[PDB]
Design an enzyme around this catalytic site. Structure first.
Site, PDB file in Angstrom:
ATOM      1  CD  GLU A 126      -2.033  -3.174  -0.555  1.00  0.00           C
ATOM      2  OE1 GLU A 126      -3.257  -3.459  -0.564  1.00  0.00           O
ATOM      3  OE2 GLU A 126      -1.525  -2.886  -1.680  1.00  0.00           O
ATOM      4  CG  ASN A 168       4.972  -4.046  -0.728  1.00  0.00           C
ATOM      5  OD1 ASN A 168       5.532  -2.918  -1.083  1.00  0.00           O
ATOM      6  ND2 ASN A 168       3.930  -4.254  -1.513  1.00  0.00           N
ATOM      7  CG  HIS A 205       0.927   1.870  -6.360  1.00  0.00           C
ATOM      8  ND1 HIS A 205       1.462   1.662  -7.627  1.00  0.00           N
ATOM      9  CD2 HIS A 205       0.932   0.901  -5.638  1.00  0.00           C
ATOM     10  CE1 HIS A 205       1.477   0.369  -7.607  1.00  0.00           C
ATOM     11  NE2 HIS A 205       1.163  -0.149  -6.372  1.00  0.00           N
ATOM     12  CD  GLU A 233       2.914  -3.211  -5.292  1.00  0.00           C
ATOM     13  OE1 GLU A 233       1.791  -2.634  -5.870  1.00  0.00           O
ATOM     14  OE2 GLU A 233       3.082  -3.898  -4.349  1.00  0.00           O
ATOM     15  CG  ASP A 235       2.054   2.408 -10.574  1.00  0.00           C
ATOM     16  OD1 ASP A 235       1.838   3.514  -9.653  1.00  0.00           O
ATOM     17  OD2 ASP A 235       1.589   1.312 -10.677  1.00  0.00           O
TER      18      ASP A 235
END
Length: 316
Positions: A126, A168, A205, A233, A235
């Protein structure tokens, strides 16, 4: 009959984030060892967990997850080496060249420890802002110099020439976003100059019913740069409580995301950020939202499970 096995059919993997603290939960561990073939330590390998005191590395928690994973025939994704978030107090205080050096020593130390054990790392995490400018995030690391990212990747490669090095980030799943463009140009530049970078992790996300329409195309554009792409990641959150309709939509969203990976040869795999909705970070960072995973709070498979299974074994 498992998600990992289905993903394996096309040479891909299906992983999850593992919290060592939950390795005592029988229901949790049962699903963990059977359904996934890839593992990311949820917190055990971050900066604060691995280097509590400068120069004083502690791999207890991290090795706990690594051993479990290996014991259960799973590969492990290293997460993460350089990040503005979750830094130990001593690092938070550092700045300038000292922070730069601390960052470097951290990479060497952590990678030196897992050299030959973990083959891929989210080196930098990030680094881009969410302000909408598409520029770098103004963190203590960024203030050490715009080149801190490149330095982190060069350091990582030197520390372990065999590890796949990934950048990432989140909110880079849609090509039209400023953030996505910011990241794309960096990677592109890195590939042009020879900066060591092997993959781009798309955290993913996402929001139920709001999955970027060009998700697949975006993935492909990054892959065309000559780097592997991974959903790291995944979700897909909804406003709670959940209901039949939201769950169904979520199933469809999950299939779209996985299907997008199936259509990008360089998309190595998908990692969902957790197993059950009851231990998801979502409700904490996004109040009023949740039920983002494949298993609900009672460890019951959600409609998304069959959708994922379907996405891995067929195409629409």
């Amino acid at each position: 009959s498992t998600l990992g096995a289905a993903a394996a059919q096309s040479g891909r993997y299906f992983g999850t984030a593992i919290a060592s603290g939950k390795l005592g939960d029988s229901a949790y561990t049962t699903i963990a060892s059977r359904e996934f073939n890839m593992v990311t330590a949820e917190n055990e390998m971050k900066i604060d967990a691995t280097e509590p005191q400068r120069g004083q590395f502690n791999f207890s928690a991290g090795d706990r997850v690594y051993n479990w994973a290996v014991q259960n025939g799973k590969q492990v994704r290293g997460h993460t080496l350089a990040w503005h978030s979750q830094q130990p107090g001593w690092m938070q205080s550092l700045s300038g060249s000292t922070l730069r050096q601390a960052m470097i020593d951290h990479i060497n130390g952590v990678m030196g420890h897992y050299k030959g054990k973990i083959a891929q790392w989210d080196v930098v995490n990030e680094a881009f802002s969410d302000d909408g400018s598409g520029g770098r995030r103004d963190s203590n690391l960024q203030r050490t110099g715009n080149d801190w990212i490149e330095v982190a990747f060069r350091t990582a490669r030197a520390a372990d020439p065999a590890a796949k090095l990934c950048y990432n980030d989140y909110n880079i799943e849609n090509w039209t976003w400023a953030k996505t463009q910011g990241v794309y140009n960096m990677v592109r530049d890195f590939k042009q100059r020879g900066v060591p970078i092997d993959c781009v992790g798309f955290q993913s996300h996402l929001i139920v019913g709001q999955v970027p329409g060009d998700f697949r195309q975006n993935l492909q554009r990054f892959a065309d740069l000559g780097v592997d792409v991974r959903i790291t990641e995944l979700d897909i959150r909804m406003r709670t409580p959940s209901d039949a309709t939201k769950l169904a939509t979520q199933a469809a969203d999950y299939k779209k995301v996985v299907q997008a990976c199936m259509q990008v040869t360089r998309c190595q795999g998908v990692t969902v950020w957790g197993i059950t909705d009851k231990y998801s970070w979502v409700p904490d960072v996004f109040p009023g939202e949740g039920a983002a995973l494949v298993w609900d709070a009672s460890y019951a498979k959600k409609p998304a499970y069959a959708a994922v299974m379907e996405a891995f074994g067929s195409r629409s």
